[PDB]
Amino acid sequence: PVAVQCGRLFDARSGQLKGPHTLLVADGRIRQVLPGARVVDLGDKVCLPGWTDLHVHLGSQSSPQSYSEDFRLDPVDHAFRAVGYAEKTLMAGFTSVRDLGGEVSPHLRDAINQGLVRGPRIFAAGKSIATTGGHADPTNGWNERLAHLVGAPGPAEGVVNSVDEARQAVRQRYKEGSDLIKITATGGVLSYARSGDAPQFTVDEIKAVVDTARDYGFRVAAHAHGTEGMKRAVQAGVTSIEHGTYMDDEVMRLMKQHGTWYVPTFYAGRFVTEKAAIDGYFPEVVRPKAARIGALISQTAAKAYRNGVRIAFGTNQGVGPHGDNAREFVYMVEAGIPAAYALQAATVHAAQVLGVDDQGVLEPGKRADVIALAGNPLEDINAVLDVRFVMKDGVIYKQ
Amino acid sequence: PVAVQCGRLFDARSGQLKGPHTLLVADGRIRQVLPGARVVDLGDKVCLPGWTDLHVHLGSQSSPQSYSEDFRLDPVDHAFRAVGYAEKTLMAGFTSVRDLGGEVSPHLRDAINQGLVRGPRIFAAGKSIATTGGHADPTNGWNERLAHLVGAPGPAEGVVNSVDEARQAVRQRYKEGSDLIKITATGGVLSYARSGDAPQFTVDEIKAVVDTARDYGFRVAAHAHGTEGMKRAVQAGVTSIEHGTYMDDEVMRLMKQHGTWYVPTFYAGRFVTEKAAIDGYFPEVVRPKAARIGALISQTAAKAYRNGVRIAFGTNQGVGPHGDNAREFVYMVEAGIPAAYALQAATVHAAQVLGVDDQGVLEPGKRADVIALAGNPLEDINAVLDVRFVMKDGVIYKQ
Amino acid sequence: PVAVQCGRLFDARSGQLKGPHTLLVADGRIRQVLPGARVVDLGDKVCLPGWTDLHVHLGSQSSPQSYSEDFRLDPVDHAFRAVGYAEKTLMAGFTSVRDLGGEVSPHLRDAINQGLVRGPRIFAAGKSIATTGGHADPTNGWNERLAHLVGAPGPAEGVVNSVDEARQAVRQRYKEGSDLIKITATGGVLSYARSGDAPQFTVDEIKAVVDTARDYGFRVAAHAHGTEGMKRAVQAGVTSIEHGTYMDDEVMRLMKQHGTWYVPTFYAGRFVTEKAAIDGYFPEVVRPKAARIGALISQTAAKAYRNGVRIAFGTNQGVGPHGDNAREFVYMVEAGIPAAYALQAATVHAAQVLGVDDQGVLEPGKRADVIALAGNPLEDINAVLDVRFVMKDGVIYKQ
Amino acid sequence: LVRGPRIFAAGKSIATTGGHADPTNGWNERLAHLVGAPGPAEGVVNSVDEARQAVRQRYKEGSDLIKITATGGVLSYARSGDAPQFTVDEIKAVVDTARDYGFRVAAHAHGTEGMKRAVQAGVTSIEHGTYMDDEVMRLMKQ
Numbered sequence A, B, C: 001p002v003a004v005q006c007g008r009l010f011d012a013r014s015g016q017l018k019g020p021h022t023l024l025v026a027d028g029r030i031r032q033v034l035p036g037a038r039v040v041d042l043g044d045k046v047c048l049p050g051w052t053d054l055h056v057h058l059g060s061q062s063s064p065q066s067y068s069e070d071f072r073l074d075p076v077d078h079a080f081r082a083v084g085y086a087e088k089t090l091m092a093g094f095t096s097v098r099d100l101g102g103e104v105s106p107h108l109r110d111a112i113n114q115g116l117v118r119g120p121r122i123f124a125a126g127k128s129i130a131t132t133g134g135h136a137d138p139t140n141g142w143n144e145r146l147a148h149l150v151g152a153p154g155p156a157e158g159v160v161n162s163v164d165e166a167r168q169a170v171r172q173r174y175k176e177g178s179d180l181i182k183i184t185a186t187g188g189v190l191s192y193a194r195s196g197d198a199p200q201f202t203v204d205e206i207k208a209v210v211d212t213a214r215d216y217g218f219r220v221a222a223h224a225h226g227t228e229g230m231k232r233a234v235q236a237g238v239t240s241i242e243h244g245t246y247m248d249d250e251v252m253r254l255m256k257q258h259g260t261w262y263v264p265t266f267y268a269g270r271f272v273t274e275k276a277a278i279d280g281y282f283p284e285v286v287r288p289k290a291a292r293i294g295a296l297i298s299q300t301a302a303k304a305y306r307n308g309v310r311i312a313f314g315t316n317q318g319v320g321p322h323g324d325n326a327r328e329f330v331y332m333v334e335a336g337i338p339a340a341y342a343l344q345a346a347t348v349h350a351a352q353v354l355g356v357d358d359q360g361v362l363e364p365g366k367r368a369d370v371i372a373l374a375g376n377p378l379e380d381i382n383a384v385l386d387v388r389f390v391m392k393d394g395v396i397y398k399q
Numbered sequence D: 001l002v003r004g005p006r007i008f009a010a011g012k013s014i015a016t017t018g019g020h021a022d023p024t025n026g027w028n029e030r031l032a033h034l035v036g037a038p039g040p041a042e043g044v045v046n047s048v049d050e051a052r053q054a055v056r057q058r059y060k061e062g063s064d065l066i067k068i069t070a071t072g073g074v075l076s077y078a079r080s081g082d083a084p085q086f087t088v089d090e091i092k093a094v095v096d097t098a099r100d101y102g103f104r105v106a107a108h109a110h111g112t113e114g115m116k117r118a119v120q121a122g123v124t125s126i127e128h129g130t131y132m133d134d135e136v137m138r139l140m141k142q
């Protein structure tokens, strides 16, 4: 057991900063919250619940050589890099993440759960599900020789073109040990393809995916830049929409009526626009899309917040450098979202998005994921960049 | 010809113990039953019809090395073990069995019918039919290298994901010489998978399987632990439900309305719970499921019997050691089922489940499958563990 | 322990019938022989060591449908037939055999050694080694479609065409669990090919096979009908020559100088010639060879015995019906070989051919393989057809 | 990226068919049929040219030295543990090819005959050496 003494306590359920409190931690869970057994003295720090990043890619990090290192590097090298990526993420203050694509992440989650390596609690989607020529198609851009040798991808590889193939793909992801399902409803900006906002799924295919995923207890996250694919995904019944660059009034109304969550990923847009002044960074097929679609997310997210769409915290890390996830708070506040709502989007709304109930608040019976900051973010949001204390499941990783 | 003199005769059609009788056997069939030509003197023994076990796996027997001996052993070694397994089963008093999975069993049935080896009369299902990642998926748990080399299984291997694939799978089982069809409606407890009670078939797929099987004269047996898969299988029209650990009131009502048979398999649950005090026996993926789902069958079976669900005899042997099938009678009686009903569930109800009419009773025109016991099971059910006489199709195998 | 009381004892080391003796058996070995503890009374029987058949095929038995049942039957059916074949062989009086081809036999040997099934002690060669189009080529006679699908066989299948391929084939047989090596030096009479006495191995290939086999402790047996292939195999240094239909003076001189053993297989020749009066029994490609080469073995074997070539006992059973191996004694005696030498060729000489030292004689420290006959074979060789007692490794199988 | 010692890696071991380092030892015939018979790219050699190709394949994959299994082992799924599994010519070919690329050869050997063959062919070190006798000791000293 251990008694943690917070100087100030942030109530995520309400959104207010309370006074001094003492946390009682035993068996990895919070047992008591008394206002005013080892002692951890944090009377000088603001004492917060652990953050959750709902959009990360722990198996990669963008670089000038990213597109070339897909035919030379093996998954073991990616696994060796993911160790440092995960340690940096956990030390930045994020005790839980949702991985939205990649085959190394389930193995990293299993290794972290066994105590082999240090990192956050990972909810992994595994392989993304796409159509032929879609944003997540694994053989996009290959020359005809390589495509001929490797064959046309199918449901086992995540590429579907009918209802039965979608059902088989969801079952294949369940077989491989996934926690949720990720689909690419439209085209993207970083893939080796032409379109970036065209509808790539039919409504029937998305409905089949959602219906199959509901049987296995999964939730579905949909990547969407264009309006028609976003509308189709929202009407089919997905749980969250990522990016959503070209959201309009009708999509906003449908999302409000359906209770869909929106994850904007400010950081990815800002990073890809800043990496445009640099002359050689992107292939000639990707650079126009990256110049066009980026940095239009900020206005869309501000409009969505003003219109009443529920917003949750996500960064799309793996485009940006791991361990720098907290600058998304500063980006969110700069766009007009209040600091308290920005902090709630990472604790209580993130738990709602994940579909769990044992995390997000410092209440009895919940997991003991506690962090502390030197300053107060409610007045200066830059205080999120200095984390002094990190605890996860009752184990202290940074003191 | 031969005249068998039973001291006491058990009437399976009614469930009562009659007085002395003389059986007249010729050409493998019973011709005459007279109350009060070679002579077989069994005046000291209770004279019964041969038993039928509706759930066996003659091609395997569980052991501490069971999971490893799937990449080292060939089917010929399994065939060499099945000879002793079948002889033990026949000597235990069971003249007929229903094999519910395995590729060696049809060959063993053909060999026994030709007189090459000794054993009971086998009704074989062959390969089980499942979905991707299902309980009967042959490549569950393999590393990605082996899965890549062997390819994704399809209907010829028994893995289906649509209506047409299910039709093709039923036709493939018919082509390979099967007598019935077996599907896994939910997950299991002994497979290398995560879920154990999730719905793995849609209603349309099960209906397609049942409709195709009806054309070829087949019956469908469904493995089911969870409630939703059990409900789907019952509504689609299967003939019997195996295990049924999480049966509730609605499933019971549907089964009573549809006339579905229930096979609980007490022995498998008792054996898997007893093999839990032993420290190392099961893989870490299987042991929680085996600790959770086992020994909950006894209360479910007792409740089903009290509610009026038709119950038939089955053991799931191959988990337990072959030749010990008769302890299921003692388990059945311990749970509250009367001894006479327990004996009827193996003779006349088993014949109804199989869909035959020439066995189960000692009536003229029926097969001459007669056994004898030293004691009386109606007062002491432990008398089923001492079989003195075994006859099958007019041939005496134990005297 | 057990004390066996033989009425008359045959001394294999000398070849004489001694007087009454008492055998002392414990731990599966003979411990004491005393002229003149349970008691086995065999005072009325001649007490002999167990016989060894150096040429059997326990995985097959020739029939009118033999050539068709290579595309319809699976190895499991052959395994189910081999159980009865092995029991018949053991009951005929043969406690040890050398299997000279077939993939089921190593598995049968493993099953017998574990006590699963009853049979003799098997020394198995596994897959035969041949060249392209050779007598043991597994795809001889297939239409071009099947040959195209299955591909051209290589060293892993037993087909070699160079020194390195022969080395790899010997290593592959060692990997699969073989006890010796079998090659086909010439063509055959029962295969689906044209030639029956042409040289199919070069001297270098046979020398490579012998040199590789010597490293792993193996002995080499060579199938040979024609003179040139027989000469090449003898000069390369094989241990035994089978059939040897067209042996001449030079081959006899080379065999005498090299110490090569000769196994004639009277029974196979007599069978394939008796099955010639029957109109339809053999394919039109095989029947001329079977009519020509058969029954010429008797004169060749008689000439070889007169010339001083060492002769050992073998039948080529699997062409003839299993369990009838002892008629080879009558065939041997009919050709002029003395009865005592015929009995020695199956006991003390067979052990020399196998390369073992713990069997063949009833001496202390040897295995307890004892059989008994009603009559005396030294005066009437027909007494070998009535075996009354069978013991193997101290276990009585027939009394 | 991670902490550890300085590693000199041999990569895939080089063996013969059924050898101690054979990657498909003990597999049932179905798995062996699907995966195919291993060759030089997998590290299984049966001639001089195959040994040369195997050494070149290890060089291509980024190895620092070469490891061969001269005899059988004790922890593999095989029968023999001290039988000679390489011929002298094959080991000489391996050593000669490895000398061109600056590699050294380490030989696994329990039995006496395989140990003698590896020592005479010119390997750098002998591992285990359970059944070493006087003649092998003299050859090693020389």
Ligand SMILES: C[C@@H]1Cc2c(Cl)cc(C(=O)N[C@@H](Cc3ccccc3)C(=O)O)c(O)c2C(=O)O1
Binding pocket: A057, A059, A060, A100, A101, A102, A128, A136, A187, A188, A189, A190, A191, A223, A243, A265, A268, A269, A272, A293, A294, A316, A318, A319
């Ligand atoms: C392994 C991981 C897989 C992956 C997947 Cl499945 C999707 C994305 C992705 O949605 N990228 C975005 C990047 C982006 C850029 C700007 C604004 C929003 C998003 C895109 O190209 O549209 C993505 O960026 C990545 C990625 O970084 O690599």
Ligand SMILES: C[C@@H]1Cc2c(Cl)cc(C(=O)N[C@@H](Cc3ccccc3)C(=O)O)c(O)c2C(=O)O1
Binding pocket: B057, B059, B060, B100, B101, B102, B128, B136, B187, B188, B189, B190, B191, B223, B243, B265, B268, B269, B272, B293, B294, B316, B318, B319
């Ligand atoms: C070859 C044969 C195939 C087979 C199949 Cl298809 C199904 C089962 C099976 O239903 N096992 C059950 C074992 C079990 C355990 C407890 C209570 C009920 C059943 C399960 O794991 O859910 C099963 O046990 C077996 C088996 O034993 O191996």
Ligand SMILES: C[C@@H]1Cc2c(Cl)cc(C(=O)N[C@@H](Cc3ccccc3)C(=O)O)c(O)c2C(=O)O1
Binding pocket: C057, C059, C060, C100, C101, C102, C128, C136, C187, C188, C189, C190, C191, C223, C243, C265, C268, C269, C272, C293, C294, C297, C316, C318, C319
């Ligand atoms: C499975 C087993 C494999 C086998 C092999 Cl590998 C070889 C022979 C064989 O040598 N048969 C002889 C039969 C024979 C007939 C007459 C005189 C001598 C031999 C032949 O055809 O020349 C042979 O007969 C058999 C056989 O019977 O089937």
Ligand SMILES: C[C@@H]1Cc2c(Cl)cc(C(=O)N[C@@H](Cc3ccccc3)C(=O)O)c(O)c2C(=O)O1
Binding pocket: D013, D021, D072, D073, D074, D075, D076, D108, D128
């Ligand atoms: C991945 C790695 C590969 C490997 C290889 Cl290539 C060889 C050995 C090895 O030589 N093992 C020895 C173990 C041993 C045991 C006792 C005395 C000497 C050696 C053997 O089985 O003969 C060996 O042990 C291992 C091993 O441990 O796994």
Ligand SMILES: [Zn+2]
Binding pocket: A188, A223, A224, A242, A243
């Ligand atoms: Zn995206």
Ligand SMILES: [Zn+2]
Binding pocket: A055, A057, A100, A101, A316
């Ligand atoms: Zn993404």
Ligand SMILES: [Zn+2]
Binding pocket: B188, B223, B224, B242, B243
């Ligand atoms: Zn089951």
Ligand SMILES: [Zn+2]
Binding pocket: B055, B057, B100, B101, B316
């Ligand atoms: Zn079962």
Ligand SMILES: [Zn+2]
Binding pocket: C188, C223, C224, C242, C243
């Ligand atoms: Zn032959």
Ligand SMILES: [Zn+2]
Binding pocket: C055, C057, C100, C101, C316
């Ligand atoms: Zn033969």
